[PDB]
Design a protein around this ligand. Structure first.
Ligand SMILES: [Cl-]
Ligand SMILES: [Cl-]
Ligand SMILES: [Cl-]
Ligand SMILES: [Cl-]
Ligand SMILES: [Cl-]
Ligand SMILES: [Cl-]
Ligand SMILES: [Cl-]
Ligand code: NA
Length: 129
């Protein structure tokens, strides 16, 4: 599913991400824009053989099982395919674990490089929330 901006903001708010671990909703929408262009089916293969999945590009080295990342963990206890659903629940529940892990949203390279320190409220401007 390719979300609209406001559609995704609303879905993320309903799933309890607004101000989760102190990160305002616009941070999450900005991260999703630059990780996946709001496409739940986004996948990208990494040099180390791991793969990033879904709207928040969650990596199989640590967070999900894809059966092809040797020596990896599955800390969200989910198949990586769950992260590609039109239903963002699994992605959101796993992102909550990741952002609690100690480096906050710096775990997302696109957030650190493209969202951090910017006017992220712009990403939810105009939306009925
Ligand atoms: Cl947009
Ligand atoms: Cl915001
Ligand atoms: Cl594996
Ligand atoms: Cl594990
Ligand atoms: Cl599995
Ligand atoms: Cl959803
Ligand atoms: Cl933090
Ligand atoms: Na894994």
């Amino acid at each position: 599913k390719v979300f609209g901006r406001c559609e995704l903001a609303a879905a993320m708010k309903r799933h309890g991400l607004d101000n989760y671990r102190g990160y305002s909703l616009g941070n999450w929408v900005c991260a999703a824009k630059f990780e996946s262009n709001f496409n739940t089916q986004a996948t990208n293969r990494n040099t180390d053989g791991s793969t990033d999945y879904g709207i928040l590009q969650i990596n199989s080295r640590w967070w999900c099982n894809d059966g092809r990342t040797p020596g990896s963990r599955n800390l969200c206890n989910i198949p990586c395919s769950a992260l590609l659903s039109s239903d963002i629940t699994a992605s959101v529940n796993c992102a909550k674990k990741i952002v609690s892990d100690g480096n906050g949203m710096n775990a997302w390279v696109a957030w650190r490089n493209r969202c951090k320190g910017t006017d992220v409220q712009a990403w939810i401007r105009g939306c009925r929330l």
